[PDB]
Amino acid sequence: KQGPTSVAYVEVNNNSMLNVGKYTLADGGGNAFDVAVIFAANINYDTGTKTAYLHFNENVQRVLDNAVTQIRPLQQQGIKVLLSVLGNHQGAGFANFPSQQAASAFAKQLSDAVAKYGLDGVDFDDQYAEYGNNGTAQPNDSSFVHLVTALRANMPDKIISLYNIGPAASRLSYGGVDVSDKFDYAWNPYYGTWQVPGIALPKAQLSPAAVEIGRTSRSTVADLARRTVDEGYGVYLTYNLDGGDRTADVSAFTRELYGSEAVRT
Numbered sequence: 047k048q049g050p051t052s053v054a055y056v057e058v059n060n061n062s063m064l065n066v067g068k069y070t071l072a073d074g075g076g077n078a079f080d081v082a083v084i085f086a087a088n089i090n091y092d093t094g095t096k097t098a099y100l101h102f103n104e105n106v107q108r109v110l111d112n113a114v115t116q117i118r119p120l121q122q123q124g125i126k127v128l129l130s131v132l133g134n135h136q137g138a139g140f141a142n143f144p145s146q147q148a149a150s151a152f153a154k155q156l157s158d159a160v161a162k163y164g165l166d167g168v169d170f171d172d173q174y175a176e177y178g179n180n181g182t183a184q185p186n187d188s189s190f191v192h193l194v195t196a197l198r199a200n201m202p203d204k205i206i207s208l209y210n211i212g213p214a215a216s217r218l219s220y221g222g223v224d225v226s227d228k229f230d231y232a233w234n235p236y237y238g239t240w241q242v243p244g245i246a247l248p249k250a251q252l253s254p255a256a257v258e259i260g261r262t263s264r265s266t267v268a269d270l271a272r273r274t275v276d277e278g279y280g281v282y283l284t285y286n287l288d289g290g291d292r293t294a295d296v297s298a299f300t301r302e303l304y305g306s307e308a309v310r311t
Contacts (some may be wrong), residue, residue, distance in 0.1 A: 047076025049304040050274055054079040054167060055285040059105045064115045064288050067123050069296045070083035074305030078296050081126040083169050084109060088134035093180045098138035110163045128205055129159065130169040137182030139175025141213035149192035157201040167205025172212025185213035191220035198228040207231040210243040212241050233283040238262040250280030259287045264298040271302035
């Protein structure tokens with residue numbers, strides 16, 4: 047059990063977080079997955095007040111409300127559980143907070159959730175915001191910087207990761223500060239592709255590869271897992287693992303990343 051940190055996004059709208067723990071290495075019995083990501087909470091907008099607010103749909107809330115059975119078991123296994131935040135077509139996004147005050151208010155909701163439900167961190171996925179909807183402004187230079195600065199200040203010992211996509215991802219500097227080193231990980235958003243995140247983080251914390259379990263061919267899965275190890279990258283991003291039998295799809299990257307087949311319980 048040595049090798050790249052494998053990440054697993056799970057669409058909690060349809061699937062349980064618990065499948066992530068079902069795969070172990072036939073060699074040593076280590077976890078096939080090191081980080082599980084709850085996908086996902088949203089950034090909504092209150093037009094009347096012109097303020098954004100964090101929002102969990104009924105499915106996201108169910109797993110959170112049920113943390114003890116859906117989350118703790120992964121954590122007791124040694125698997126880190128993060129919560130991903132994504133746009134929700136309301137004009138409000140991570141890149142258009144009008145002020146440091148507004149940004150910090152949103153950061154607080156995220157850190158409060160992490161603390162409340164016993165999470166290991168937050169993940170930013172800047173897609174679907176639709177900047178401009180509801181009289182909102184387009185992305186700016188300070189918003190994302192203000193947001194990450196605030197989030198890191200109040201939760202210093204947690205994981206902060208970035209889905210390398212959307213306006214925010216390319217807005218890491220403002221004032222005199224680069225929030226690059228405030229993140230722990232950053233990864234390629236395009237499944238079935240290689241794409242080295244441009245963020246100034248060391249290879250140990252970057253995942254140029256992104257695959258969708260059950261959709262990306264095992265040929266491309268193994269190929270990217272191989273390149274990840276060869277080129278010296280420390281992370282391997284996986285998405286949409288479900289409850290069906292995915293042992294061969296998982297073994298396809300574990301053979302390359304950890305030199306072991308995967309096994310399912």
